[PDB]
Design a protein around this ligand. Structure first.
Ligand code: HEM
Length: 153
């Protein structure tokens, strides 16, 4: 997994995110969308946004983003022991939202791109690998539940 040190780099870069969840959330969504338009399609709720400007205006985009990052935040802090937490999430996304794991991959990227854009100073070579490792662990586990739930294999 992640060493204890790796988990500390992660918990650390994450306390930056917690001083502003809604704004970090909002920018990760914008980037994912601007970046994988198709992922945009998954949200009824947001298909109708046609420009960055539009995404940036959306109260509800900003709120969905808080929610996404509040939920990851809660997983991250279990530092690995996030079975109880990952479950509801893999259930909902596998079966209701129908999110492919590739998408999880896109978001991970979106998330890392925001931390680099915003915390270049706190998000060095080490914070970088800590973080991406924590996120592949998360995808990998998501992935696992899918397989079992009997999904995208
Ligand atoms: C770090 C990755 C993610 C986290 C922590 C996350 C978290 C959440 C949470 C907490 C909810 C609300 C509760 C629930 O339905 O279980 C939700 C809903 C949803 N998620 Fe995600 N999600 C992630 C990635 C994605 C991705 C990549 C997509 C698809 C592009 C996605 C699509 C959706 C949709 C369509 C909804 C329903 C929102 C609505 O329309 O009310 N999520 N997600």
């Amino acid at each position: 997994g992640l060493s204890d040190g790796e988990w500390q780099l992660v918990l650390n870069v994450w306390g930056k995110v917690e001083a502003d969840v809604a704004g970090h959330g909002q920018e990760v969504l914008i980037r994912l969308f601007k970046g994988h338009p198709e992922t945009l399609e998954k949200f009824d709720k947001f298909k109708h946004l046609k420009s960055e400007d539009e995404m940036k205006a959306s109260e509800d985009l900003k709120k969905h983003g808080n929610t996404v990052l509040t939920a990851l935040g809660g997983i991250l802090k279990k530092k690995g022991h996030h079975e109880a937490e990952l479950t509801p999430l893999a259930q909902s996304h596998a079966t209701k939202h129908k999110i492919p794991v590739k998408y999880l991959e896109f978001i991970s990227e979106a998330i890392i791109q925001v931390l680099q854009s915003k915390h270049p100073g706190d998000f060095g070579a080490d914070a970088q690998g800590a973080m991406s490792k924590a996120l592949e662990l998360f995808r990998n586990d998501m992935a696992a539940k899918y397989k079992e739930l009997g999904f995208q294999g």
